[PDB]
Amino acid sequence: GSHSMRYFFTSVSRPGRGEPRFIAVGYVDDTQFVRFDSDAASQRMEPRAPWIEQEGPEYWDGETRKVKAHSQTHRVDLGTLRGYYNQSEAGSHTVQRMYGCDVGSDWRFLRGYHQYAYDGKDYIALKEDLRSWTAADMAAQTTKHKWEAAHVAEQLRAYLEGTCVEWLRRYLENGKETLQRTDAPKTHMTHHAVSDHEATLRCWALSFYPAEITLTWQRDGEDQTQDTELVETRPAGDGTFQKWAAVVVPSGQEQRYTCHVQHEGLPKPLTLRWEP
Amino acid sequence: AGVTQTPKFRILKIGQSMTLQCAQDMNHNYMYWYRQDPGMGLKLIYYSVGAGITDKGEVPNGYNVSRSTTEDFPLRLELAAPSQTSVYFCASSFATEAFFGQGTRLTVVEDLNKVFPPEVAVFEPSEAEISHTQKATLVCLATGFYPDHVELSWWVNGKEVHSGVCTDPQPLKEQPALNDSRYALSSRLRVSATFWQDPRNHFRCQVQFYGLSENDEWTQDRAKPVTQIVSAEAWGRA
Amino acid sequence: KEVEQNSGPLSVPEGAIASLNCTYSDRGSSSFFWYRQYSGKSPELIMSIYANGDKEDGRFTAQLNKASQYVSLLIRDSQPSDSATYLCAVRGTGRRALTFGSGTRLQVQPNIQNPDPAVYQLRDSKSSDKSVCLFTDFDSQTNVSQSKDSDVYITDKCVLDMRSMDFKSNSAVAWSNKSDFACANAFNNSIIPEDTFFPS
């Protein structure tokens, strides 16, 4: 299957409460492997998956130096953005950054990402061609001109289409037991009266990995795309995911509905019916 | 529109203080000070990743810096030592390219009495060269100067020339065993026999020496060795 | 230590490829640069590279081999005006300053089509007993030796470009106040061409 590596960074200003909060998290596919928190005791990049603990001190010194350098960049960027938007130091503001790479089943590069948000709105992003920038507004156009004048894109492309892929391949081989696995969903149905004349049917998928799944409800074999409640896919806390999909049905015609479960871990898609 | 570093040249006595100025108008977050000894590479003294942030480089002992502002990164020498004789470069960066200042040539002297301006002589082309080659080489000799803070230029009919010039890239020490040896520098200007034999033609070797300022105690019998131009001239002839 | 270059000097004939090489210790280094520094002047960026492969910019090629931790600059069709120190600069893992190598001094030697080696005596423009000796017009393979005596001053060879006639020539200068110094013996400590011309 296809794989990805992503880093997510959140910088939050804290008026009169000292330095901004900085949080960095690294993922391979739907597995977290590293964190940094400005407010934690270590002041180190920290492992969050057993396979990355195999990496030696040169790895960890390097990642710690790089993540501390990002924290300092974002501290200045909070100040810059206040200048660009004529905003005082009294308010709390948020910078978000994300970057990473996707590979196919052959572990060859598919695409890269580098993008920022300010107070929950798109700010600047590298375009899919890796050669140009999309700028949300006039402040972002100031950033874009600085990055164009300094030829930042060629340095960034070198990481996204090269270094990033090399790291991901290294992690996929060293983490193969954790990362190159599929856990098929354990499924079941619940039944609740909402009226004297209708009931909720709830299709459950539990303990699955990776997070991508499709739950669909059919009424006499037709998709209920308008009439289905689906919750957000949610972490179990043990490295697996959970989801459910519900339909409200005429009480006594439960047996007319089918739930359909599709996941990379299933040899064939599952069908479930209410069994009272 | 770049990195403005001052001064170009400086003499300090052992124990004196100075500030090396560095400014940039590019809004660069990153600034740097490096030093470079003769025939060697650049060594990082101090760097700054933004206003109010400064960190030690590879050779920080001796120096202090401040980054109050985005534009300015002064380097303070607190107590001049002979080990600090070097060329100092300021640089800025946005992210990729490092833009360098013009550099500051600093010599630390035990005694201002060791400072001497150059003597300058011009030597006229040999008739044998003119006959043999139809070319005419002038030589300029600048002798007996310390420190090695000189700029040598040729002027033909009041116009500075670059073509047909070779200046030695380093001076000779008159006393190679001594750290405070005075220096000698040679330059050549070569022209056609015809250009030299045209007697309308005026040739001047100029040496700009960077020495002592107005506000320096001067005890000695000899003239104060201040920043000055020492020259010698030749006229063309048939 | 962190960035290694041979200091040279690297002597390259005019028109040949100058090959400048650099190795670096930190395997995670992201950014590699060549800087050119003319004698007495500041370093100037001439090439940037970030990925395995090669980049051309006129007569310059840079190539990066991250697996071998090796970076190269080629100067094609090398000219005497390329004569300068070439500094490799590398940004290490998580660093925010460049680490410079100690540099390689490149000396591109002019091709002297019709050598006419000679030693000439030049007299002071202000009248005096003062003179200098000029060794000139020798091929670029001749090396000039420092003086044996300490009251005899001999410069290194210098390349002069008469740009209007596209004419380059080598020269060295020797002088002394010693009464018994003569142009005839000034360059005796040097291997000079047998056919060198000495006017009386």
Partner: peptide, 9 residues
């Protein structure tokens, strides 16, 4: 592994 770009907004 993290990116090493020095660029500020």
């Amino acid at each position: 592994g993290l990116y090493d770009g020095m660029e500020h907004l």
